[PDB]
Design an enzyme around this catalytic site. Structure first.
Site, PDB file in Angstrom:
ATOM      1  N   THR C   1     -34.042 -33.549  51.781  1.00  0.00           N
ATOM      2  CA  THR C   1     -33.030 -34.252  50.941  1.00  0.00           C
ATOM      3  C   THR C   1     -32.266 -33.260  50.070  1.00  0.00           C
ATOM      4  O   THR C   1     -32.858 -32.355  49.480  1.00  0.00           O
ATOM      5  CB  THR C   1     -33.689 -35.321  50.041  1.00  0.00           C
ATOM      6  OG1 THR C   1     -34.233 -36.362  50.860  1.00  0.00           O
ATOM      7  CG2 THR C   1     -32.683 -35.933  49.069  1.00  0.00           C
ATOM      8  N   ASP C  17     -27.098 -36.236  50.881  1.00  0.00           N
ATOM      9  CA  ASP C  17     -27.081 -36.201  52.340  1.00  0.00           C
ATOM     10  C   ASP C  17     -27.604 -37.543  52.856  1.00  0.00           C
ATOM     11  O   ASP C  17     -27.865 -38.447  52.064  1.00  0.00           O
ATOM     12  CB  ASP C  17     -27.910 -35.029  52.874  1.00  0.00           C
ATOM     13  CG  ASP C  17     -29.399 -35.285  52.809  1.00  0.00           C
ATOM     14  OD1 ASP C  17     -29.896 -35.629  51.715  1.00  0.00           O
ATOM     15  OD2 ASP C  17     -30.073 -35.148  53.851  1.00  0.00           O
ATOM     16  N   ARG C  19     -30.107 -37.788  55.666  1.00  0.00           N
ATOM     17  CA  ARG C  19     -31.283 -37.630  56.521  1.00  0.00           C
ATOM     18  C   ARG C  19     -32.549 -38.062  55.791  1.00  0.00           C
ATOM     19  O   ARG C  19     -32.827 -37.584  54.692  1.00  0.00           O
ATOM     20  CB  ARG C  19     -31.434 -36.176  56.972  1.00  0.00           C
ATOM     21  CG  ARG C  19     -32.712 -35.905  57.754  1.00  0.00           C
ATOM     22  CD  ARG C  19     -32.824 -34.447  58.155  1.00  0.00           C
ATOM     23  NE  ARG C  19     -31.882 -34.096  59.214  1.00  0.00           N
ATOM     24  CZ  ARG C  19     -31.765 -32.883  59.751  1.00  0.00           C
ATOM     25  NH1 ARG C  19     -32.528 -31.878  59.331  1.00  0.00           N
ATOM     26  NH2 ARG C  19     -30.876 -32.671  60.715  1.00  0.00           N
ATOM     27  N   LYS C  33     -28.984 -42.840  50.237  1.00  0.00           N
ATOM     28  CA  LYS C  33     -29.792 -42.347  49.119  1.00  0.00           C
ATOM     29  C   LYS C  33     -29.148 -42.617  47.765  1.00  0.00           C
ATOM     30  O   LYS C  33     -29.804 -42.494  46.731  1.00  0.00           O
ATOM     31  CB  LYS C  33     -30.041 -40.852  49.286  1.00  0.00           C
ATOM     32  CG  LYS C  33     -30.715 -40.519  50.602  1.00  0.00           C
ATOM     33  CD  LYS C  33     -30.927 -39.031  50.770  1.00  0.00           C
ATOM     34  CE  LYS C  33     -31.523 -38.738  52.135  1.00  0.00           C
ATOM     35  NZ  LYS C  33     -32.035 -37.347  52.208  1.00  0.00           N
ATOM     36  N   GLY C  47     -38.033 -37.196  46.910  1.00  0.00           N
ATOM     37  CA  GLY C  47     -39.484 -37.360  46.823  1.00  0.00           C
ATOM     38  C   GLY C  47     -39.952 -38.533  47.662  1.00  0.00           C
ATOM     39  O   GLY C  47     -39.497 -38.713  48.795  1.00  0.00           O
ATOM     40  N   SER C 129     -35.310 -30.957  48.583  1.00  0.00           N
ATOM     41  CA  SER C 129     -35.640 -29.746  49.341  1.00  0.00           C
ATOM     42  C   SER C 129     -34.443 -28.811  49.521  1.00  0.00           C
ATOM     43  O   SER C 129     -34.616 -27.605  49.691  1.00  0.00           O
ATOM     44  CB  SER C 129     -36.219 -30.113  50.711  1.00  0.00           C
ATOM     45  OG  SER C 129     -35.356 -30.993  51.410  1.00  0.00           O
ATOM     46  N   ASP C 166     -30.862 -26.323  54.740  1.00  0.00           N
ATOM     47  CA  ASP C 166     -32.167 -26.962  54.541  1.00  0.00           C
ATOM     48  C   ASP C 166     -32.490 -27.865  55.731  1.00  0.00           C
ATOM     49  O   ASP C 166     -31.678 -28.711  56.113  1.00  0.00           O
ATOM     50  CB  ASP C 166     -32.178 -27.771  53.239  1.00  0.00           C
ATOM     51  CG  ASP C 166     -33.467 -28.548  53.037  1.00  0.00           C
ATOM     52  OD1 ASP C 166     -34.548 -28.022  53.371  1.00  0.00           O
ATOM     53  OD2 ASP C 166     -33.396 -29.691  52.536  1.00  0.00           O
ATOM     54  N   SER C 169     -32.712 -31.657  55.074  1.00  0.00           N
ATOM     55  CA  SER C 169     -31.444 -32.344  54.846  1.00  0.00           C
ATOM     56  C   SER C 169     -30.546 -32.244  56.070  1.00  0.00           C
ATOM     57  O   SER C 169     -30.639 -31.286  56.844  1.00  0.00           O
ATOM     58  CB  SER C 169     -30.731 -31.726  53.647  1.00  0.00           C
ATOM     59  OG  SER C 169     -31.583 -31.693  52.519  1.00  0.00           O
TER      60      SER C 169
END
Ligand SMILES: [Mg+2]
Ligand SMILES: [Mg+2]
Ligand SMILES: [Mg+2]
Ligand SMILES: [Mg+2]
EC number: 3.4.25.1
Lengths: 195, 204, 226, 232, 212, 196, 125, 222, 195, 196
Positions: C1, C17, C19, C33, C47, C129, C166, C169
């Site tokens: 994320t 993002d 994902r 999100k 999280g 992340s 990342d 993500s």
């Protein structure tokens, strides 16, 4: 534990349960009856942790007997098995769970059908033509898978059961001191005194 | 030891043109031991279908719980619950056990009776909703299902084509999982007819 | 994320993002999100996804009741105080890490909040992340007195950094812009730089390919009359 | 098996049209203590190679000696030691990569992450990574530790793939590296303001820049930040 | 994995499944659990795939060196003991092996040795090894006779693996059959469990619990 | 973290760095660790950010309710409320708080409340991970009854060194001056204090 | 202290009347008129803002209240009793519905919840 | 404590045709949630018409490939430039792997080429040397996503001929190199969508009697 | 382990050893002979860790057979038992110790006396009139303490042994599949094929 | 332990406390931590007393054998021998050594060898548990090319503070002066340095 087997034939359910009670080093008893009659046409065998097995079985017995008196009516095997499952499902997330596995063999007088229910200590219920708990199934299911027929007589069921017990007596390391065999049918519950 | 993989099994759901499909295997086991080949993991409350994978005692318990709740819903609301609403109920019910959760992987599938819109949704064991347009997977062969579904799936499939797609996704995923298989069922769901098909598969 | 929050001239922008993952597996390729606490107070969560949703809706519900009780539009500091006191009480066991942003009669606000109950103030923040990838972009291009257009650009660029660099993500960029004296504009899939290419082959099967044992009609209708 | 004691943080690097750039700060940390402030972590080998090292400093000083010994050994009975038979970046890397993997295979690693930057005989750019596990990889941009998380994303915006390398000048590459070092100073708690930067170009050779500082920092906006929520 | 081997009038029947798993993930359905040590000797694979493959291939090399030096076929006793003595040297290091070394010589007749990674070496008439061994033992024990025909013996071994493949989650794929004679082993084909199950169900009337 | 509070002639000054770390990552480089629990009673926070924020918020609530009933609380009273929370919940807290305040009767006062929940009234106090490196410097350079400018220089120099050696400390140096004149916020940037 | 009134204050009289409910209805009768009309494409609810004093700002007193985005309420009788019922009605719409189903309750069910609260004040101690 | 192992991700795929073989693998190298390289070759031409990939811990993978290439070199020196057959290479790799039985190469190795009758061949190894000739084998991170697909689309598993309803299986007709590459590309495209460690690029090595050919295809970089 | 019993009567030594071999879940064999003839008048039974038991026994056998050939002479039971003890005493402080317990039953032709030696895996040797290893002694020693006489015949020894086995079959949880019984006397070693 | 070595105009001075502890018990209150490995090459020892004594004894042996063959070794050479032992045996040692020496060519030099076995040539070095408390003081007060008296005062003041705050440090302050003139031992007692 030990050995609780169940087989549902044409017109009856047969429960076979070992007689041994072992406390660690010694075999304290070789004639123990690991079963309780819940109602005239419903029998429950059990295996698991010491103390909890009998405590649970008698607790269930008392509850079904209470229901029978209150309503003047015998609950169907399905209804009894659902009640038992809920009690075990309730028990796993408890402070101290009952570690008890049961087989419920009953004859439904309304449908005129034998019924065998297998329920483990988690509350995992399945209706089966034949069932077991612990390692018993590992030795016996290959024989039952081969020989079982839904139209078997009670006598044929007992013969197939003898073959299962013989295989257990051959390949199991524990001496379980034979089995007590009980038959559940339209006339109620009776014990086979020579096996 | 891991509660989500003691009993094994899988569920997959897909959307098509004016239809949804949901399918599951029939296995119940005690780790290596196969116990039942008739353990259906899909239930329905009116026209809303719920597949549940994971610990079998919780699967049975949650079915009984959602039957309970959808029956009271209907008596009070005087109408059958919709998939979107039921999805939130599942999410709510799971999260209320946040720190003592049911070890399950639920999947909702159905068609909104008013809008006619196909709907599917997935959850983790504590209620996080995954509302995918395409497909939802759950169970001990979820990785395999993700692989099958990702390659086999295309949007706007007709009911009879969607059946083949989802059936093949399930079957081949199950055949690469030790703890899944022993039979399978597929529900094809349209706005006012639902067909249920038992698949023939290998029994090992 | 990857999630970011960026302050600008007359408001605040938040981005994320799309994902969602189950370990190394992508569960949903177009997750939303960006959540709404109130019409003009939005937040993004990293999280434990169930915790971030449950805690948003709970505080969002209580914020709505509070707004009705006080006959005032909800404030970001209220959402924050309620969130942090809830999270602190559960000693980090509710794994909610949020960036909270919004406008209210007091002005525009941007906060971050961590699972144990600590909060922070900032002009630009990142979480998840891909926060380090995003923060690298924010630290390179952020300035004082950004315009709305500059802030949206910076936010989405910071999310892209997370998407590309990342592994946690990916997929698309969602944005929500909260400007003072205006309706908050939620821009779902503001960017779409990860469309899957056409496959080499169709995997549509011939009908009758799957073997079937039994067919039956399922009665979804209620018990019928007559 | 060991634990790193005195450590160096990120080493960052990238390719550009005519060569490579590599950079690393001058700090030797002792846990959270910023113990040693004049540590050179870029070590040139000849005029065509620079080895950047992060992680354990005692192991870095050992590797530094191995490289110094390598140059001595290559010159032995070698009339072309300063010409055709001079050490190449590829020779130096493969040697280190061999040593690193051998040491991890004896369960006694050199607790480092290393980037070998240089230009080959034919003018080709060389940039490859190796660490305590013996893991190796190459990329248009390479960075260790925190640089991997914060510098790479920035450097990859300049050179995102192989075809971007000829389009990238030395001024643009150096600018990107210097900016990345500033970002690391903002965000890495085990970083310092002082750093070294080396450019290896196929035309202008090795340019080694010492005593560089992070400048043009943004802090003024801190004055407006008050409390942690409700404080005014 | 499920492997069995039994002695009878016509020699030895060896029967195995074909499944390999890595946790719940079915890695392969086409593994060869019978290692052809040489034209006269067979070995079963259980436990460590590599350990069994490697050392039973090595065993064949030792058996070949023996017959070159001694100008005589190696006994099953001697062949099995070379392997058991080898793995006994490695005891504690973590080898994983459960194998049946099967052969038919003049002096011995049909012989089976169960050899195991903790050093066990047992001569016997019937052995079953693997996660599905208990299921196979049930079918074996109730139907085994010394005076079985080669045809009926082959079927019994096939049927016993099928029993395991059905019930044991980690057993399945296909059944490989071997018949060991004095003049060497004879391969009796690969049998897909999927197809075999339905065939056996119909022809035998077994597995009435399963719907087909 | 590097925090300190120093009494001087006209009152008291609180000082702090602005670095907040999650391991080696600086999660916030412009943190405000000088927090207000009353008009002229502030505190410096070290330890768990969640704990010290929660405590400070509860103290601010207690002193707001105190003020409504009994008028302006003393710095000693504020320190006691801090202590009560820290001591009684010592098993579940990781908080190192310095309390600083200005009365007209008592003037500048400083109380330090370390991990255990003890209270220590001091002329000046230092705390946080960076304080270890400046125990020697602060002991040698502190004087009682310094001027405002001397005290600002003392804190600036002290925290400059703490920041220099402690990786967990850094960013800007924030200061809050508490006197009869009112409340003054100060900020000092890296380019200023690094060359000291 | 402790609430020692654990017994019903509303009871059946010999004639079968629940006095306190009848008297509550009498209080409603004295209250200012409010009305509701349902149309094909909407509903209207209305009442008079009987200002107690001209110095009072009657805009600050809301007789018509939003319960949910799609549900409103008006009353006749005791204003303070109405105000607290609106607070309880708003909260119960969330606690017993929105936090469960993720949507606002239908009119009839929210009414049912308000009705339950009013019934309990007729039987509880 | 020192952990001598790591995981560099990656996914590889070997398919054996009738007179050819392919060995494909993504070009992405990772640790945890970071990308090390978007193009780090993983499938190698080892000479003698053999291609190899050792997927998992890249340091062990590089070491093994390096040692095998060296084994090919010495096989020529010791045995009069004799061509190393794919079966002989497989057995040799078993011994390389089992040589480190008690401190294994943490890799899943696959080799591909042609057997001595000119037919396509793939061999698959576990970390400690157990191996088998296979028709189809995916290895690495997304192997569980790819293999079920291949069972269905290469071996036509669970597919029956329409009208017969399960009585007649779909016949196993031979696939061309073009058909196989389509399945490889679709396998990696799908794996890239659903596995975070898979992406960036796809490099395929095709082996025929004419030699070894390469094909490269882009994959999503998120 | 299992059950290895020994009893020294007037003119012979009798060793009784169980026939079961159990590998965890299943009983792999029910006719295993847990004994080796070290010399014509010396027999050794054994129980302990899998693999090590047979490896140790055969190693001892080979060494005693080597001695017999070299000297053209049979070592006394006492000499053999001392050799075996030293090997086990050496083994405990080894890199990987043999976990093997043995009984050595021999007839000393020089003294014309039967002799029974009990040696555990530590190298703890004792000469006894009757002995056992593992849990076998716990069930059988009370019977042997009561009935044993030094002047018993071989037939009386076998009858006392049957009583011991019966008690084991009654109170032990493990099914050890009966015992193989061997007699060591002046004429050598022979097996009782019906027990 | 509190140890330091400081270069100055005429050479170098080593300084140390005299406290050796076993937990909270002071096993020796008059320890000599300034050890001689050559005439004008000394070292300060911190960490395991057994390890640092064993190392110093081996180094003294190496430099004695060096001198017999190649003449007087450099301070750099002595530091290298220390480093070689500390680095190659890092798994089994707990040693933090400061090496200080005087050449006529190189004059005063200081090398610090921390736990890992790395070498760092410095104008001055501090080490031991007590050094943490004087990083700020020493950084602010050190100057290059100080006089003998200034350097003695700098070390005396620095170690005074280290002793003041570190319970593991204490006793007397020992010093060794290394110059062209020779080797001078100094000692300073509590009553002297505590009042500074
Ligand atoms: Mg399966
Ligand atoms: Mg199976
Ligand atoms: Mg700092
Ligand atoms: Mg990807």
């Amino acid at each position: 534990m030990d050995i609780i087997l169940g087989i549902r034939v044409q017109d009856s359910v047969i429960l076979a349960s070992s007689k041994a009670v072992t406390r660690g080093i010694s075999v304290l008893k070789d004639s123990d009856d690991k079963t309780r009659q819940l109602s005239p046409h419903t029998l429950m065998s059990f295996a698991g942790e010491a103390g909890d097995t009998v405590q649970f079985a008698e607790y269930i017995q008392a509850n079904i007997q209470l229901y029978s008196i209150r309503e003047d009516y015998e609950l169907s095997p399905q209804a009894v098995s659902s009640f038992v499952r809920q009690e075990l499902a309730k028990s796993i997330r408890s402070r101290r769970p009952y570690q008890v596995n049961v087989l419920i063999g009953g004859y439904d007088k309304k449908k005129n059908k034998p019924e065998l229910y297998q329920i483990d200590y988690l509350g995992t219920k399945v209706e089966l033509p034949y069932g077991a708990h612990g390692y018993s199934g590992f030795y016996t299911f290959s024989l039952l898978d081969h020989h079982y027929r839904p139209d078997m007589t009670t006598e044929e069921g007992l013969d197939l059961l003898k073959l299962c017990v013989q295989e257990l007596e051959k390949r199991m390391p524990m001496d379980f001191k034979g089995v007590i065999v009980k038959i559940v049918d339209k006339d109620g519950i009776r014990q086979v005194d020579d096996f | 030891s891991d509660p989500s993989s003691i009993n094994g099994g899988i569920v997959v759901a897909m959307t098509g043109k004016d239809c949804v499909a949901i399918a599951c295997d029939l296995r119940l086991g005690s780790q290596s031991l196969g116990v039942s080949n008739k353990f259906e993991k899909i239930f329905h409350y009116g026209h809303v279908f719920l597949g549940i994978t994971g610990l079998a005692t919780d699967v049975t318990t949650l079915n009984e719980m959602f039957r309970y709740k959808t029956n009271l819903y209907k008596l009070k609301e005087e109408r059958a619950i919709e998939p979107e609403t039921f999805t939130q109920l599942v999410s709510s019910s799971l999260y209320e056990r946040r720190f003592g959760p049911y070890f399950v992987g639920p999947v909702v599938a159905g068609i909104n009776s008013k809008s006619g819109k196909p709907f599917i949704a997935g959850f983790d064991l504590i209620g996080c909703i995954d509302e995918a347009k395409d497909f939802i997977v759950s169970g001990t062969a979820s990785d395999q299902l993700f692989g099958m579904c990702e390659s086999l799936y295309e949007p706007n499939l007709e009911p009879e084509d969607l059946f083949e797609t989802i059936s093949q996704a399930l079957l081949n995923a199950a055949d690469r999982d030790a703890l899944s298989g022993w039979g399978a069922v597929v529900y094809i769901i349209k706005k006012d007819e639902v067909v249920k098909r038992y698949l023939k598969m290998r029994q090992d | 994320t990857t999630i970011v929050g960026v302050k600008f001239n007359n408001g605040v922008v938040i981005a994320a993002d799309t994902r969602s993952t189950q370990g190394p597996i992508v569960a949903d390729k177009n997750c939303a999100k960006l959540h709404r606490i109130s019409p003009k107070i939005w937040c993004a969560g990293a999280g434990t996804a169930a915790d971030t949703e449950a805690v948003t809706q709970l505080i969002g519900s209580n914020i709505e009741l509070h707004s009705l009780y006080t006959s005032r539009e909800p404030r970001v500091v209220s959402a924050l105080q309620m969130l942090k006191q809830h999270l602190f009480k559960y000693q980090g066991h509710i794994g909610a890490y949020l960036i909270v942003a919004g406008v209210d009669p007091t002005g525009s606000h941007l906060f971050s909040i961590h699972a144990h109950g600590s909060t922070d103030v900032g002009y630009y923040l990142s979480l998840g992340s891909g926060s380090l990838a995003a923060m690298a972009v924010l630290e390179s291009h952020w300035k004082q007195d950004l315009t709305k257009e500059e802030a949206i650009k910076l936010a989405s660029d910071a999310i892209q950094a997370g998407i590309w660099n990342d592994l946690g993500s990916g997929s698309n960029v969602d944005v929500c812009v909260m400007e003072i004296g205006k309706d908050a504009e939620y821009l779902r899939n503001y960017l779409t730089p990860n469309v899957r290419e056409e496959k080499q082959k169709s995997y549509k099967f011939p009908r009758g390919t799957t073997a079937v044992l039994k067919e039956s009609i399922v009665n979804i209708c209620d018990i019928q009359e007559e | 098996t060991q634990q790193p004691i005195v450590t160096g943080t990120s080493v960052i690097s990238m390719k550009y049209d005519n060569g490579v750039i590599i950079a690393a700060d001058n700090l030797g940390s002792y846990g959270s203590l910023l113990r040693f402030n004049g540590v050179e972590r870029l070590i040139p080998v000849g005029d065509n190679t620079v080895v950047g090292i992060s992680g354990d400093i005692s192991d870095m000083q050992h590797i530094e000696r191995l490289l110094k010994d390598l140059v001595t050994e290559n010159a032995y009975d070698n009339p072309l030691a300063d010409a055709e038979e001079a050490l190449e970046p590829s020779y130096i890397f493969e040697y280190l990569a061999t040593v690193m993997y051998q040491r991890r295979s004896k369960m006694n690693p050199l607790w480092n992450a290393i980037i070998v930057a240089g230009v080959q005989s034919n003018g080709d750019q060389f940039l490859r990574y190796v660490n305590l596990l013996g893991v190796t990889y190459s990329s248009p941009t390479l960075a260790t530790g925190f640089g991997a998380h914060m510098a790479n994303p920035l450097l990859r915006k300049v050179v995102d793939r192989e075809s971007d390398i000829p389009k990238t000048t030395v001024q643009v590459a150096e600018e990107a590296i210097v900016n990345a070092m500033r970002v690391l100073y903002y965000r890495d708690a085990r970083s310092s303001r002082n750093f070294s930067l080396a450019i290896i170009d196929k035309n202008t050779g090795l340019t080694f820049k010492k005593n560089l500082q992070v400048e043009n920092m943004k802090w003024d906006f801190a004055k407006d930040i008050k409390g942690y929520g409700t404080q005014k | 994995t499920t492997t069995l081997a039994f002695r009878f009038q016509g020699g030895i029947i060896v029967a195995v499944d074909s499944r390999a798993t890595a946790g719940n993930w079915v890695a392969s359905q086409t593994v060869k659990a019978v290692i052809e040590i040489n034209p006269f000797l067979l070995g079963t694979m259980a436990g460590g795939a590599a350990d069994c493959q490697f050392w039973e291939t090595w065993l064949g090399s030792q058996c070949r060196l023996h017959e070159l030096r001694e100008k005589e076929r190696i006994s099953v006793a001697a062949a099995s003991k070379i392997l058991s003595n080898l793995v006994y040297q490695y005891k504690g290091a973590g080898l994983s092996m459960g194998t049946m070394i099967c052969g038919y010589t003049r002096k011995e007749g049909p012989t089976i040795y169960y050899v195991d990674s903790d050093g066990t070496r047992l001569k016997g008439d019937i052995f079953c090894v693997g996660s599905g061994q208990t299921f196979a033992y049930g079918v074996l024990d109730s139907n085994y006779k010394w005076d079985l025909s080669v045809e009926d013996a082959l079927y019994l071994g096939k049927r016993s693996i099928l029993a395991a493949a059905h019930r044991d989650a980690y057993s399945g794929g296909s059944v490989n059959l071997y018949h060991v004679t004095e003049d060497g082993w004879i391969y009796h084909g690969n049998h897909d469990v999927g197809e075999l199950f339905w065939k056996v169900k119909e022809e035998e009337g077994s597995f009435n619990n399963v719907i087909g | 973290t590097s925090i300190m509070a120093v009494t001087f002639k006209d009152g008291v000054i609180l000082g702090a760095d602005s670095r907040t770390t999650t391991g080696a990552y600086i999660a916030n480089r412009v943190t405000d660790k000088l927090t207000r629990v009353h008009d002229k009673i502030w505190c410096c926070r070290s330890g768990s950010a969640a704990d010290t924020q929660a405590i400070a918020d509860i103290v601010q609530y207690h002193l707001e309710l105190y003020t409504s009933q009994y008028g302006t609380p003393s710095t000693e009273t504020a320190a006691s409320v801090f202590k009560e929370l820290c001591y009684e919940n010592k098993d579940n807290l990781t908080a190192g708080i310095i309390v600083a305040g200005y009365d007209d009767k008592n003037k500048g006062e400083v109380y330090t409340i370390p991990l255990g929940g003890s209270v220590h009234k001091l002329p000046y106090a230092i705390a946080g991970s960076g304080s270890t490196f400046i125990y020697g410097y602060c002991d040698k350079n502190f004087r009682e009854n310094m001027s405002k400018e001397e005290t600002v220089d003392f804190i600036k120099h002290s925290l400059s060194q703490a920041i220099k050696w402690d990786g967990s400390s850094g960013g800007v140096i924030r200061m809050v001056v508490l006197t009869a004149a009112g409340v003054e916020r100060l900020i000092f940037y890296p380019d200023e204090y690094e060359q000291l | 202290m402790t609430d020692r009134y654990s017994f019903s204050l509303t009871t059946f009289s010999p004639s079968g009347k629940l006095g306190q409910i009848d008297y509550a209805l009498t209080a409603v009768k004295q209250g200012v008129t409010s009305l509701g009309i349902k149309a094909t494409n909407g509903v209207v609810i209305a009442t008079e803002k009987k200002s107690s004093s001209p110095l009072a700002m009657s805009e600050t007193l809301s007789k018509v209240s939003l319960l949910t985005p799609d549900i409103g309420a008006v009353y006749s009788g005791m204003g303070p009793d109405y105000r607290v019922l609106v607070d309880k009605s708003r909260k119960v719409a969330h606690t017993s519905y929105k936090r469960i189903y993720g949507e606002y309750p239908p009119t009839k069910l929210l009414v049912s919840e308000v009705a339950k609260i009013m019934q309990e004040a007729t039987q509880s101690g | 404590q020192f952990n001598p192992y790591g995981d560099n991700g990656g996914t590889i795929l070997g398919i054996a045709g009738e007179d050819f073989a392919v060995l494909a693998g993504d070009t992405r190298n990772i640790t945890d949630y970071s990308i090390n390289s978007r193009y780090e070759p993983k499938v190698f031409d080892c000479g003698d018409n053999i291609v190899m990939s050792a997927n998992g811990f890249a340091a062990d993978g590089d070491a093994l490939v390096k040692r095998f290439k060296n084994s090919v070199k010495w096989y020529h020196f010791d045995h009069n430039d004799k061509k190393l057959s794919i079966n002989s290479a497989a057995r040799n790799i078993q011994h390389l792997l089992y040589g480190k039985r008690f401190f294994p190469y943490y890799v899943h190795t696959i080799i591909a080429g042609l057997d001595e009758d000119g037919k396509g061949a793939v061999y698959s190894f576990d970390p400690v040397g157990s191996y088998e000739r296979e028709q189809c084998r995916a290895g690495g991170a997304a192997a569980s996503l790819i293999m079920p697909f291949l069972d269905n689309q290469v071996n036509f598993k669970n597919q029956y001929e329409p009208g017969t309803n399960g009585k007649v299986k779909k016949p196993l007709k031979y696939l061309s190199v073009e058909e196989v590459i389509k399945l490889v590309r679709d396998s990696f495209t799908s794996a890239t969508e659903r596995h975070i460690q898979v992406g960036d690029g796809l490099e395929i090595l095709i082996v025929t009697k004419d030699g070894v050919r390469k094909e490269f295809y882009e994959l999503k970089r998120d």
